[PDB]
Design a protein around this ligand. Sequence first.
Ligand SMILES: *[C@@H]1O[C@H](CO)[C@@H](O[C@@H]2O[C@H](CO)[C@@H](O[C@@H]3O[C@H](CO[C@H]4O[C@H](CO)[C@@H](O)[C@H](O)[C@@H]4O)[C@@H](O)[C@H](O[C@H]4O[C@H](CO)[C@@H](O)[C@H](O)[C@@H]4O[C@H]4O[C@H](CO)[C@@H](O)[C@H](O)[C@@H]4O[C@H]4O[C@H](CO)[C@@H](O)[C@H](O)[C@@H]4O)[C@@H]3O)[C@H](O)[C@H]2NC(C)=O)[C@H](O)[C@H]1NC(C)=O
Ligand SMILES: *[C@@H]1O[C@H](CO)[C@@H](O[C@@H]2O[C@H](CO)[C@@H](O[C@@H]3O[C@H](CO[C@H]4O[C@H](CO)[C@@H](O)[C@H](O)[C@@H]4O)[C@@H](O)[C@H](O[C@H]4O[C@H](CO)[C@@H](O)[C@H](O)[C@@H]4O[C@H]4O[C@H](CO)[C@@H](O)[C@H](O)[C@@H]4O[C@H]4O[C@H](CO)[C@@H](O)[C@H](O)[C@@H]4O)[C@@H]3O)[C@H](O)[C@H]2NC(C)=O)[C@H](O)[C@H]1NC(C)=O
Ligand SMILES: *[C@@H]1O[C@H](CO)[C@@H](O[C@@H]2O[C@H](CO)[C@@H](O[C@@H]3O[C@H](CO[C@H]4O[C@H](CO)[C@@H](O)[C@H](O)[C@@H]4O)[C@@H](O)[C@H](O[C@H]4O[C@H](CO)[C@@H](O)[C@H](O)[C@@H]4O[C@H]4O[C@H](CO)[C@@H](O)[C@H](O)[C@@H]4O[C@H]4O[C@H](CO)[C@@H](O)[C@H](O)[C@@H]4O)[C@@H]3O)[C@H](O)[C@H]2NC(C)=O)[C@H](O)[C@H]1NC(C)=O
Ligand SMILES: *[C@@H]1O[C@H](CO)[C@@H](O[C@@H]2O[C@H](CO)[C@@H](O[C@@H]3O[C@H](CO[C@H]4O[C@H](CO)[C@@H](O)[C@H](O)[C@@H]4O)[C@@H](O)[C@H](O[C@H]4O[C@H](CO)[C@@H](O)[C@H](O)[C@@H]4O[C@H]4O[C@H](CO)[C@@H](O)[C@H](O)[C@@H]4O[C@H]4O[C@H](CO)[C@@H](O)[C@H](O)[C@@H]4O)[C@@H]3O)[C@H](O)[C@H]2NC(C)=O)[C@H](O)[C@H]1NC(C)=O
Ligand SMILES: *[C@@H]1O[C@H](CO)[C@@H](O[C@@H]2O[C@H](CO)[C@@H](O)[C@H](O)[C@H]2NC(C)=O)[C@H](O)[C@H]1NC(C)=O
Ligand SMILES: *[C@@H]1O[C@H](CO)[C@@H](O[C@@H]2O[C@H](CO)[C@@H](O)[C@H](O)[C@H]2NC(C)=O)[C@H](O)[C@H]1NC(C)=O
Ligand SMILES: CCC(CC)[C@H](NC(C)=O)[C@@H]1[C@H](O)[C@@H](C(=O)O)C[C@H]1NC(=N)N
Ligand SMILES: CCC(CC)[C@H](NC(C)=O)[C@@H]1[C@H](O)[C@@H](C(=O)O)C[C@H]1NC(=N)N
Ligand SMILES: CCC(CC)[C@H](NC(C)=O)[C@@H]1[C@H](O)[C@@H](C(=O)O)C[C@H]1NC(=N)N
Ligand SMILES: CCC(CC)[C@H](NC(C)=O)[C@@H]1[C@H](O)[C@@H](C(=O)O)C[C@H]1NC(=N)N
Ligand SMILES: [Ca+2]
Ligand SMILES: [Ca+2]
Ligand SMILES: [Ca+2]
Ligand SMILES: [Ca+2]
Ligand SMILES: [Ca+2]
Ligand SMILES: [Ca+2]
Ligand SMILES: [Ca+2]
Ligand SMILES: [Ca+2]
Ligand SMILES: [Ca+2]
Lengths: 388, 388, 388, 388
Amino acid sequence: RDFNNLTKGLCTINSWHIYGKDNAVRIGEDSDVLVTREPYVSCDPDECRFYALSQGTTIRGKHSNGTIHDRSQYRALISWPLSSPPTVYNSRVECIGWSSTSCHDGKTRMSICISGPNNNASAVIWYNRRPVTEINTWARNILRTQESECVCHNGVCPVVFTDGSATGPAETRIYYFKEGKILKWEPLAGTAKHIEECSCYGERAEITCTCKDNWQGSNRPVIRIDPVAMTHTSQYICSPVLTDNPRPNDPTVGKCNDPYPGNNNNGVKGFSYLDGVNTWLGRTISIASRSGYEMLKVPNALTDDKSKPTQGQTIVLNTDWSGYSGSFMDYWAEGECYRACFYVELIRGRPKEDKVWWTSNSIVSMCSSTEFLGQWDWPDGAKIEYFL
Amino acid sequence: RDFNNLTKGLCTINSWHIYGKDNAVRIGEDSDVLVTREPYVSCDPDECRFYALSQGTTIRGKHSNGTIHDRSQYRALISWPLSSPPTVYNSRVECIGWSSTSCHDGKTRMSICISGPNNNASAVIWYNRRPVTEINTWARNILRTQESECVCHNGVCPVVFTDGSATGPAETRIYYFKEGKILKWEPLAGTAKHIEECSCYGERAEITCTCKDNWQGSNRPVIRIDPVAMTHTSQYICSPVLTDNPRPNDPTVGKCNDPYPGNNNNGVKGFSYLDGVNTWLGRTISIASRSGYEMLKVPNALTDDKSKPTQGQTIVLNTDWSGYSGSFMDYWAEGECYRACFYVELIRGRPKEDKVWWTSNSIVSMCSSTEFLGQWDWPDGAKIEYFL
Amino acid sequence: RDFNNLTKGLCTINSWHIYGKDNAVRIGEDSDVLVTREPYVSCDPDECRFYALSQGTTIRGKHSNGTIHDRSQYRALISWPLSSPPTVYNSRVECIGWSSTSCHDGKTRMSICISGPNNNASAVIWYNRRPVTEINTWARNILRTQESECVCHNGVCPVVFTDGSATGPAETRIYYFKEGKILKWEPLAGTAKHIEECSCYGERAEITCTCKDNWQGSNRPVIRIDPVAMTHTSQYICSPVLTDNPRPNDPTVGKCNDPYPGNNNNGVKGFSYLDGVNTWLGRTISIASRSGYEMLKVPNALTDDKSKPTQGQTIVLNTDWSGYSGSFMDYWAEGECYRACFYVELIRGRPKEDKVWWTSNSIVSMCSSTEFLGQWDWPDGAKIEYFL
Amino acid sequence: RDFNNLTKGLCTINSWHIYGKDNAVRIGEDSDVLVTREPYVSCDPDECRFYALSQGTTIRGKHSNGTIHDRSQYRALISWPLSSPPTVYNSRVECIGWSSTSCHDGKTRMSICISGPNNNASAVIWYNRRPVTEINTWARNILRTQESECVCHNGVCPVVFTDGSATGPAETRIYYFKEGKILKWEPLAGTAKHIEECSCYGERAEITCTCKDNWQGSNRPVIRIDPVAMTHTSQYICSPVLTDNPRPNDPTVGKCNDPYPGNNNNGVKGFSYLDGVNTWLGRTISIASRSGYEMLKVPNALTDDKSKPTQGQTIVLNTDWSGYSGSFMDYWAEGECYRACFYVELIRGRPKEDKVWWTSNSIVSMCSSTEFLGQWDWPDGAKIEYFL
Ligand SMILES: *[C@@H]1O[C@H](CO)[C@@H](O[C@@H]2O[C@H](CO)[C@@H](O[C@@H]3O[C@H](CO[C@H]4O[C@H](CO)[C@@H](O)[C@H](O)[C@@H]4O)[C@@H](O)[C@H](O[C@H]4O[C@H](CO)[C@@H](O)[C@H](O)[C@@H]4O[C@H]4O[C@H](CO)[C@@H](O)[C@H](O)[C@@H]4O[C@H]4O[C@H](CO)[C@@H](O)[C@H](O)[C@@H]4O)[C@@H]3O)[C@H](O)[C@H]2NC(C)=O)[C@H](O)[C@H]1NC(C)=O
Ligand SMILES: *[C@@H]1O[C@H](CO)[C@@H](O[C@@H]2O[C@H](CO)[C@@H](O[C@@H]3O[C@H](CO[C@H]4O[C@H](CO)[C@@H](O)[C@H](O)[C@@H]4O)[C@@H](O)[C@H](O[C@H]4O[C@H](CO)[C@@H](O)[C@H](O)[C@@H]4O[C@H]4O[C@H](CO)[C@@H](O)[C@H](O)[C@@H]4O[C@H]4O[C@H](CO)[C@@H](O)[C@H](O)[C@@H]4O)[C@@H]3O)[C@H](O)[C@H]2NC(C)=O)[C@H](O)[C@H]1NC(C)=O
Ligand SMILES: *[C@@H]1O[C@H](CO)[C@@H](O[C@@H]2O[C@H](CO)[C@@H](O[C@@H]3O[C@H](CO[C@H]4O[C@H](CO)[C@@H](O)[C@H](O)[C@@H]4O)[C@@H](O)[C@H](O[C@H]4O[C@H](CO)[C@@H](O)[C@H](O)[C@@H]4O[C@H]4O[C@H](CO)[C@@H](O)[C@H](O)[C@@H]4O[C@H]4O[C@H](CO)[C@@H](O)[C@H](O)[C@@H]4O)[C@@H]3O)[C@H](O)[C@H]2NC(C)=O)[C@H](O)[C@H]1NC(C)=O
Ligand SMILES: *[C@@H]1O[C@H](CO)[C@@H](O[C@@H]2O[C@H](CO)[C@@H](O[C@@H]3O[C@H](CO[C@H]4O[C@H](CO)[C@@H](O)[C@H](O)[C@@H]4O)[C@@H](O)[C@H](O[C@H]4O[C@H](CO)[C@@H](O)[C@H](O)[C@@H]4O[C@H]4O[C@H](CO)[C@@H](O)[C@H](O)[C@@H]4O[C@H]4O[C@H](CO)[C@@H](O)[C@H](O)[C@@H]4O)[C@@H]3O)[C@H](O)[C@H]2NC(C)=O)[C@H](O)[C@H]1NC(C)=O
Ligand SMILES: *[C@@H]1O[C@H](CO)[C@@H](O[C@@H]2O[C@H](CO)[C@@H](O)[C@H](O)[C@H]2NC(C)=O)[C@H](O)[C@H]1NC(C)=O
Ligand SMILES: *[C@@H]1O[C@H](CO)[C@@H](O[C@@H]2O[C@H](CO)[C@@H](O)[C@H](O)[C@H]2NC(C)=O)[C@H](O)[C@H]1NC(C)=O
Ligand SMILES: CCC(CC)[C@H](NC(C)=O)[C@@H]1[C@H](O)[C@@H](C(=O)O)C[C@H]1NC(=N)N
Ligand SMILES: CCC(CC)[C@H](NC(C)=O)[C@@H]1[C@H](O)[C@@H](C(=O)O)C[C@H]1NC(=N)N
Ligand SMILES: CCC(CC)[C@H](NC(C)=O)[C@@H]1[C@H](O)[C@@H](C(=O)O)C[C@H]1NC(=N)N
Ligand SMILES: CCC(CC)[C@H](NC(C)=O)[C@@H]1[C@H](O)[C@@H](C(=O)O)C[C@H]1NC(=N)N
Ligand SMILES: [Ca+2]
Ligand SMILES: [Ca+2]
Ligand SMILES: [Ca+2]
Ligand SMILES: [Ca+2]
Ligand SMILES: [Ca+2]
Ligand SMILES: [Ca+2]
Ligand SMILES: [Ca+2]
Ligand SMILES: [Ca+2]
Ligand SMILES: [Ca+2]
């Protein structure tokens, strides 16, 4: 009943344990499972749930045809019980739109959905399941946001938005909301040259967001926000362990204040936990496509431009499809530290599997362990041939 | 735990933002979605839900054949979570019947359902999910009511009913209920000549209802109710911007105290927000059929017989089917004013799409913003060819 | 939180209004609706629900074949929200068995299910959703009970059971339970010669049960129970308006203390409200089969052997199938009197409709009004041809 | 709100009454029922639920093919309302994995799921629906646990795990958890030579577990745990009434401190209630396959190596398939004693019914009665031919 404060630091990450997995595409082959994409996980004080952008049709439905498309009037942010699949009957609509973010401040939840045509989109900010504030596009070119949870501190929940070209300079803004109202907003500052789809987490009154430089960088831009002062900084992960996709092969020295070149106008949402020697980066295994997923322990990745891995864990084999990935934590758990968690979107269907006419995904999610646990791989598990 | 009082005025409407959309016909192509019509939205102090008259069959079910019919023994008022579709498994039956209204008074909900043959229908008034009062037909010709939410003030919830011919003078009554009991009723007074399907909202201890003159008027009749004195007045929207359907082309001067002629014996349920310069009217785009939907800002529409639009917003393109529309507000929201909202029923199937043997709909709903937001169009989205 | 006491009398019954209807067979043609039979309605202090004996299969399922059978290991007492259909996903299992009763005492619910082979059945009495007491068959011939709600007074909930032949003298017992424990039991006394499937209601600290004399009577046996003294009496409804089925044509004088002859070894569960001039009897319209349903006002039917109808209401046309019927009331409603209610089981399938291989039903239920309301008829509504 | 203490003794078992049955395979022939195996039952202070390991697909789904397999990435521990079937829409995922246990301590529930490849599995211990502790494999050979509920006393919930060969000596550990944290662990001691899948219950501050000696014994190993001292003992049921499967014919003298020989490297999870003369053993009827199920009253079975049955009850006929069986009790029921309960997994499909490509099960469960109740048999009830 009081706003949550980010008073703890991250727990020591020595490995990752399975947290949730919905097997949605497998189950949806013969049950009323909604087509989704851009999933994430977010916790309330008494429950943690899966979230995603529905496409407003089931996977077996005839309206699944054409669901590779990103922005239609039939999309909505939905949430559903942890590890169940997103069904027609258990999915709760949080708001209507084709780009979203959502977070609980300790008292209630803020959810944000953006909708509209490319040149006239608008964000609606919901708080306590009611619409409170609206924001019109400022650059008239696909106003858009995180696609994973936001983070709050003493009621202030910063959110990163981008409006403008995805393949050149754009207008990124950091909005500071409280009870769904705008306290302040600032234009992006720092050395990040382009920002998309930030994945954020909080610890010791600081919010760290790992984003995607769609324009030029194969290294990831990082925004660090002070939610009390309502100010931020930006840079890139200095490490040569490159974590966007597609991307060039890893070098031996990265770039701290500029995009690491080699691949232009493409990328995938991803994340990292940046905490000195307790630093872990996620990335696709393939440098060319959204296939495979691994976690690499890269001490001081944010600030050391020669930092390389000292430990790792395979999450998804390179022979299995992956997709977006993002961070979340259960800020209401017991204990002295916050346990880092992440999800990986396992994309099925188009464009990589074009024998089917749809595009959907399932979710797998892990949280850190202080033990050094054995590893397994966690594929989507569905057989495309069954849907033919 | 206290009855709600209409103490606030309307927020300034500068545009409309998306509030909810269930994509029911799209989803129902491959899931157990009930056939409905005559939908609406209504809020409780802790939740807002979609409501509609079920036809007692799913859309893919063989019993969907013949659902163009208005009044069968298989209909019921159902409610379901905001923006989910009306499924067999998540729909809550409020009462049995083929005409309804429902509203929360701040303590609990009153729901009214009318059933019976044309010459012997009766209304049952439920309060706190129990039947409390019954009213027999008084004119023996399809006793019927709003098809959208009623409004309460200090426990008094006025409801408009009509019994008698739909194409000549009829017997309209305004009932004032409190805890599901009849405090008083009055025959319609004022200059409205015929009343059907009123759409109501409340602000500053006054309830305004925009209804449909099925007999002669293409302008809409308006009933204004004082819920404390339990008295009312009636007139027509004076504006030349005609909002029924079908309707003749717009003139330059309307009629305040008589039906605007040109079209007889037909009409569609609709609504308006009448608040001086903050006045917005909804209407179908087509003058001939239930196609398209737009909101027009028409300053002083109620009292100015030459008032024309000063701003507008397209909700549904004229190349997409629309249908009934009505008003509702979240009277339990935070803030200093009541935010105007509306829904549009998107009718699919018969009679306009007769390759299918059913008639159903989906819902789209918006609420006002004080920003001037970009506009999008919101069609039902289902492909009729898939149901063949 | 206190046990309910039967302190009120019945409201004056001047007509019947629609209360609930699930349209289960119609909806179940294309959705996962369980096959049932022997339904009823029962209220808790905060909700009223539909109850029935599942057959442990959906209607469209291949295991629906053979569901005319009464007693299998796949049956269970289930409950579900008022007017929704009994689906796989919303049905709550109360206990396992093929004969049941259930009632709320004001604090929590007692549910009783009987299971077993014909010569070795046993009743399990559940209280607060936990098994508390068990009763073994005493006559080794289909131990069985009401098939509709029981009634409680100050925690004492009497229940009528029968064990022994259905076509000759049997051993009927009245058990008085409190918190699921046996306080006392008594053998049937009075002039009723055979008792089956009692339908009960309570008012002014007396419980009245209208049962079925399967052996010889076409008039119905009546048991009146004093739940404080834990004693009872039995007789038959004296009226010549005969209410079992099948039955001979109505005479002009009935029998008070013996079975009215003409039909042997058959019958249907039914009910009545016996309250002086406020007396209403339900019955099938047909004298030969379970078809049609009507309510007849028969002043002093219990004690006047020449009493005939003074008013009536058709519930189901004689061209539509009916079935079991029973009484229930919402003992937790507001107001000064208890409103009489009843349900009618609308049986579909075998044996009357043998083109399908299943037997199921839907439910329709009404409650009394003090108004003289217009009447409608309420058929099941499903088209058997669709299931072929 | 206080930890539960095992202060009561067992009620006198004079017979068994039906408690729950989900008919999952029958219902799942035409509804969205998940494929499962390794089910169990466990109670919270306010509800009792069915639990099982999902296979992450429905039974009618094409992904049901291959579900004989024990350990995939698509398995999860799920729970669902007592006697309903495990559907896609009502099943709650407790954790991800292919081996589990779960128990309520009076304050909240602890659930444990093991996942991973055979040589690198790990257990995750959840408490209050959040991950708290992780345990890595210690013998690198299928770390695994009970497959039925654990038992708590004053917050201490002992759990038995095994890691290592299933057909030779292995490394069994007894972990003592409290609030999901490890208080202590001990290696197995006593004369049991191999332990698998323990079935446990508690009474008078002692926890008794009946397990399976997969390696050499056809008699069952028994572990008795003192949850206060956090110590244990082990032996075998001395009785000649052999209760594993497959097994040799019963001798006249059993073995107390060594495996009863005749069958190697196979077995089925089972259980017993060991309480002096109030001792009842469950077993398959067949000595060769998982067919039939019976309860036998065998006074002093644990300590008397010549003890034979004095009473019995058939649960499942030998012409019907059975499977795993385990113990649970409602520790929060009213009364002076704990009522012994058990479930039997009714396995359908492979390997015994190989015309279908799946393996699943339904559940039947009973609790003891102090009456001597008539017996019935409770088969799964589904017709395999319908799934072809
Ligand atoms: C039971 O489970 C346990 C626990 O999971 C298992 O133990 C785990 O085993 C893992 C696999 O060996 C291991 O993970 C590796 O950790 C390495 C770090 O450790 C080593 O180095 C440190 C530092 O010197 C030592 O202290 C330590 O002792 C070790 O020697 C990582 O380096 C590994 O990652 C690299 O390899 C994999 C391929 O295996 C790549 O996918 C990965 O991206 C890394 O390599 C690429 O990137 C680097 C960095 O730029 C390049 O230098 C390199 O050339 C590669 O680049 C190519 O590939 C990438 C990706 O495609 C591409 O972008 C690029 O352009 C190039 O083409 C790996 O993470 C766990 O740490 C270990 N855990 C523990 C606790 O022990 C155990 O095996 C299991 N048991 C059984 C029996 O199965
Ligand atoms: C990004 O989004 C923003 C925000 O949504 C977009 O900006 C919006 O743009 C809208 C479209 O232009 C605009 O809506 C129009 O507003 C007009 C009022 O503004 C004009 O007049 C006022 C008053 O003088 C000026 O102050 C102002 O500056 C403007 O000049 C309305 O008049 C418009 O409605 C009329 O036109 C549409 C067709 O476009 C009809 O559907 C509608 O019914 C109205 O016209 C009929 O009715 C009138 C009244 O009787 C008749 O006079 C007229 O002849 C028409 O009658 C025929 O048609 C009807 C209907 O079929 C029939 O019944 C009748 O019989 C006749 O056959 C319209 O509402 C928004 O206000 C504007 N918002 C803002 C904040 O700017 C922006 O464009 C987007 N950007 C991009 C790049 O897309
Ligand atoms: C709008 O709705 C309103 C309200 O519903 C409608 O008004 C209702 O109209 C109903 C139909 O007319 C009416 O119900 C009838 O009531 C009769 C009692 O009223 C009459 O008698 C009293 C006493 O003298 C007068 O005071 C009063 O003014 C009336 O004259 C009942 O007697 C009626 O039931 C009998 O008829 C029906 C057939 O219509 C049978 O189904 C029924 O079982 C009864 O008859 C059988 O049983 C009796 C008793 O033994 C026998 O004597 C008789 O021969 C019949 O027996 C055969 O049939 C049975 C059944 O199959 C079989 O077992 C037996 O062996 C024999 O074969 C009937 O109940 C409502 O009371 C009335 N309500 C009000 C408030 O007015 C209005 O019409 C609607 N408007 C429109 C325009 O539709
Ligand atoms: C109404 O319901 C009531 C209540 O349920 C019914 O009454 C019940 O009737 C049951 C069936 O008769 C009965 O159960 C039997 O109880 C026997 C114990 O009672 C007898 O012995 C005691 C001790 O002397 C006496 O005091 C008592 O009066 C009785 O005489 C058990 O011994 C029975 O189990 C044995 O038989 C069944 C076959 O019927 C086997 O399945 C079972 O495993 C037992 O036999 C095997 O095991 C023993 C022990 O090692 C061997 O000695 C024996 O040779 C068998 O071994 C072969 O088979 C096993 C299993 O396949 C295999 O592993 C082995 O290698 C060998 O091949 C049985 O449990 C209930 O107690 C009784 N209840 C009451 C309260 O009365 C009533 O009948 C019903 N009414 C109607 C009309 O139906
Ligand atoms: C709506 O207005 C009525 C007064 O007109 C308020 O009613 C009073 O409420 C208080 C609190 O329960 C009582 O002590 C009075 O007896 C109430 N009755 C009247 C008629 O005076 C009501 O509280 C107002 N609602 C809200 C939400 O404030
Ligand atoms: C189970 O036994 C323990 C005592 O061994 C009880 O614990 C005490 O409970 C009271 C009430 O909360 C506290 O004041 C004590 O501090 C508790 N702790 C101990 C270890 O003493 C517990 O209440 C018992 N459970 C029930 C349901 O009675
Ligand atoms: C055109 C801008 C893109 C972000 C860099 C685009 N975002 C939106 C709001 O459309 C994403 C991108 O095209 C898709 C992907 O790369 O997987 C997802 C897609 N995201 C969503 N549909 N929500
Ligand atoms: C005959 C009277 C009509 C109202 C003016 C009629 N109302 C009823 C209760 O039947 C409506 C009208 O026929 C249909 C429509 O125009 O869309 C809906 C239909 N409304 C409903 N079925 N609830
Ligand atoms: C053989 C005894 C009958 C009661 C007089 C019989 N009751 C039971 C428990 O089987 C009923 C009768 O055969 C069926 C009917 O007449 O509709 C229902 C059937 N009732 C149930 N299946 N619950
Ligand atoms: C290889 C070890 C076996 C236990 C002795 C094995 N356990 C696991 C975790 O795989 C079980 C056994 O193979 C199957 C059975 O006998 O029915 C179930 C299977 N149990 C599970 N799948 N959970
Ligand atoms: Ca470089
Ligand atoms: Ca990039
Ligand atoms: Ca004019
Ligand atoms: Ca009109
Ligand atoms: Ca289906
Ligand atoms: Ca006679
Ligand atoms: Ca009879
Ligand atoms: Ca021996
Ligand atoms: Ca063995």
